[PDB]
Design a binder for this molecule. Structure first.
Ligand code: 3R6
Length: 167
């Protein structure tokens, strides 16, 4: 038994809910929240700017130190940093940004990062301002992640479409 509430079960290991991932993290304080990061860990918008805003910019301060030491992530890659006031840990995962010409095939590599963690609160990778088809992202998630993933879908209209179209 874990602390997640109100999720629809899609598979053995994948759960989904119409929820603001930033709001959900504040309530649940999960072990791992996933950020929709870019390779620079520049948390301007979407999930990263809202999680970063919810940390009062502490996520960005930590991320800048990480990049100064390590250089940029790979598209499809990840790093584990603090979860600040939202979670124990934040797994920053870089899905391909379709609006920058990145190979959508890297979405599977991105979701493979989730398998290093037993339970995660996550958004749909490469969805929103990263420009991918969220229906595709949910299919790759289901077909790639084997650990227990709690998906928060901010858009109520999209949530309903994801559920009603799910195979
Ligand atoms: C504030 S939560 C958030 C923001 C932007 C997004 O695209 C998503 C989402 O895609 O689930 C969620």
């Amino acid at each position: 038994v874990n602390s997640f509430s109100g999720y629809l079960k899609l598979t053995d290991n994948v759960y989904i809910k119409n929820a603001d991932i930033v709001e959900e993290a504040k309530k649940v304080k999960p072990t791992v929240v996933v950020n929709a990061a870019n390779v620079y860990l520049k948390h301007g918008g979407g999930v990263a700017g809202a999680l970063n805003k919810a940390t009062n910019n502490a996520m960005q301060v930590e991320s800048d130190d990480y990049i100064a030491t390590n250089g940029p992530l790979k598209v499809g890659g990840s790093c584990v940093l603090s979860g600040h006031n939202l979670a124990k840990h934040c797994l920053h995962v870089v899905g391909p940004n379709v609006n920058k010409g990145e190979d959508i095939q890297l979405l599977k590599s991105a979701y493979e990062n989730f398998n290093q963690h037993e339970v995660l609160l996550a958004p749909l990778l490469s969805a929103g301002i990263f420009g991918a088809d969220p229906i595709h992202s949910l299919r790759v998630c289901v077909d790639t992640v084997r650990t227990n993933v709690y998906l928060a879908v901010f858009d109520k209209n999209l949530y309903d479409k994801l559920v009603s179209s799910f195979l």
